[PDB]
Amino acid sequence: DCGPPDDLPSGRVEYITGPGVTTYKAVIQYSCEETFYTMKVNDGKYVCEADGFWTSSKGEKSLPVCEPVCGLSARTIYGGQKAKPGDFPWQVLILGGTTAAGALLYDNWVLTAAHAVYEQKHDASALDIRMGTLKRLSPHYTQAWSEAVFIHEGYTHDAGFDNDIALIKLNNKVVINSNITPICLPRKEAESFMRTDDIGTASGWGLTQRGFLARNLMYVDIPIVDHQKCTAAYEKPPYPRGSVTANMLCAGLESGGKDSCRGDSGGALVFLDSETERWFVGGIVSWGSMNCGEAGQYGVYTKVINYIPWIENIISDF
Ligand SMILES: Nc1nc2cc(CCNC(=O)[C@@H]3CCN3C(=O)[C@H]3C[C@@H](c4ccccc4)CCN3)ccc2[nH]1
Numbered sequence: 001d002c003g004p005p006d007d008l009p010s011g012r013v014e015y016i017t018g019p020g021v022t023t024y025k026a027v028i029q030y031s032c033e034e035t036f037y038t039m040k041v042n043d044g045k046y047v048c049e050a051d052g053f054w055t056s057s058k059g060e061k062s063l064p065v066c067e068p069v070c071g072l073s074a075r076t077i078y079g080g081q082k083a084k085p086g087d088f089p090w091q092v093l094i095l096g097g098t099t100a101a102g103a104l105l106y107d108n109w110v111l112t113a114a115h116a117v118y119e120q121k122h123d124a125s126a127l128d129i130r131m132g133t134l135k136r137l138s139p140h141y142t143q144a145w146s147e148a149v150f151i152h153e154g155y156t157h158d159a160g161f162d163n164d165i166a167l168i169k170l171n172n173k174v175v176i177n178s179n180i181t182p183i184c185l186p187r188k189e190a191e192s193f194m195r196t197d198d199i200g201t202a203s204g205w206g207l208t209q210r211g212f213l214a215r216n217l218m219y220v221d222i223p224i225v226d227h228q229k230c231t232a233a234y235e236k237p238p239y240p241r242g243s244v245t246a247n248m249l250c251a252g253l254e255s256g257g258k259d260s261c262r263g264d265s266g267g268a269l270v271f272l273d274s275e276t277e278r279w280f281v282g283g284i285v286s287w288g289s290m291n292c293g294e295a296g297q298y299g300v301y302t303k304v305i306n307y308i309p310w311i312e313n314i315i316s317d318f
Contacts, residue, residue: 002026002048009173010037010066010107024048032066036176040065068107068176071184071278077204077218078259078293085134088203089181090281091217093136094168094266095128096120099213101204102168103268103281104131104182107175109315110146110168111183112266113284113302114155117166121149127168132180134217136205142180147171150314152307162245164286164302166266167314183268184280186305193271194282194305197223200251200271202285202299206263209293213263220258225250225298233296234289247306249283252298260285260299261292269301 001023005013008030016027030044041064042056049055056064074086092102092110097119102112110129120127127149132142147169154163174180186194194200203219225233230250234243244250251269252259260267269283283301291297304311 002052002054005030005046005054006063008032008063008066010068010176011039011064022048024050028054030064036069036181037066038069040067068182070105070182071273071276071280072178072181073279076272076277077202077206077214077220077264078209078261079257080208080218080220083134083203083217083219086178088217088219088270089179090183090268091131091203093130093133093141093205095130096125099136099205099263100265101206101267101285102129103266104174104180105167105185105311105315106182107173108170109182110170111268111281111284111304111311112166112168113164113286114151114166115157115161115164115286116265117149117168118151118155118157121151121166129168129170131174136213136215136217142174144170144172144174148318150318152310160240160243161287161300161302162247165284165304165307165310167311169318183270184273184278185308185311186271186280186282187273188305188308190271190273190280190282190305193273194224194249196226198271199223200269200282202251202260202264202267202269202283204260204264204267204285206265206267206285207261207292220260222251222253222258222299225252229254229296230298230300233298234300244300247303248286249301249303250298251283251301254296256293256295256297259293259297260288260301
């Protein structure tokens with residue numbers, strides 16, 4: 001009467017009343033892989049209704065959603081040290097024009113910087129996306145490819161870095177495990193963890209103090225800089241006036257020695273929601289001075305909390 005149910009992505013169907021019964025008042029049950037995924041919308045119990053279509057205990061006749069767990073880390077680039085497996089399970093390597101990075105969202109999206117993927121999007125060439133690996137050049141990695149690249153509509157390439165943000169839709173769902181896990185998006189009160197002098201963490205394979213790209217994933221803990229000091233650090237030649245906007249945050253040391261650098265573009269500056277005990281993305285590696293690690297020449301990051309409406313619009317509509 002209602003027919004075979006639809007399959008649940010990252011979940012499955014199980015007939016409760018009997019194997020194959022699909023008639024009126026027949027009961028089925030949905031479920032996710034609860035260890036690394038969590039069911040949303042409803043509790044998964046659906047009863048065939050007189051309308052002739054499966055209906056949940058809340059009246060919905062659409063599937064539920066198996067959302068990946070996010071923000072998990074085995075913890076709990078200039079002047080950093082080597083990450084261990086599972087410290088940054090969201091870290092993504094993006095290979096195209098040059099080496100860049102991103103962060104896994106859900107199991108089929110990658111958050112990165114617009115400047116890192118702009119030339120390859122408009123050249124209509126797919127991005128080579130790798131993850132589940134600490135070594136930049138290892139042959140053993142989880143492979144994915146870009147199905148679509150969305151660059152923020154206010155971004156103007158080669159004309160500053162306001163709105164330096166982009167989303168990549170992966171053509172396949174990646175398997176979620178302790179090795180590969182997305183980063184959480186910040187909640188509306190997440191700014192309480194991103195005040196001045198609050199500590200975030202940048203990770204990447206970019207240039208180190210040696211002046212070469214790192215073979216292994218690195219990371220640094222660095223504090224948020226007062227926005228006046230951020231504006232003042234880059235309000236001078238050769239930078240255009242207004243290079244630092246309200247859509248940006250600075251991070252680093254007035255004495256120097258800890259920074260992001262070239263090759264870290266698109267990586268997530270993450271912060272710990274100490275109450276949920278989950279890591280979330282507060283920044284995206286965007287730009288900064290030529291001399292990474294130099295005193296008062298802070299790294300500049302795109303402010304992700306400003307772009308939650310844009311991210312949710314794109315992920316929900318595509
Ligand atoms: N202290 C620190 N320096 C950093 C560098 C990076 C490089 C990753 N981003 C890039 O490579 C992008 C694409 C071109 N870029 C620059 O940054 C140049 C361009 C120019 C400018 C014009 C207009 C407004 C502002 C700047 C002048 C010098 N910065 C990452 C983190 C870092 N932390």
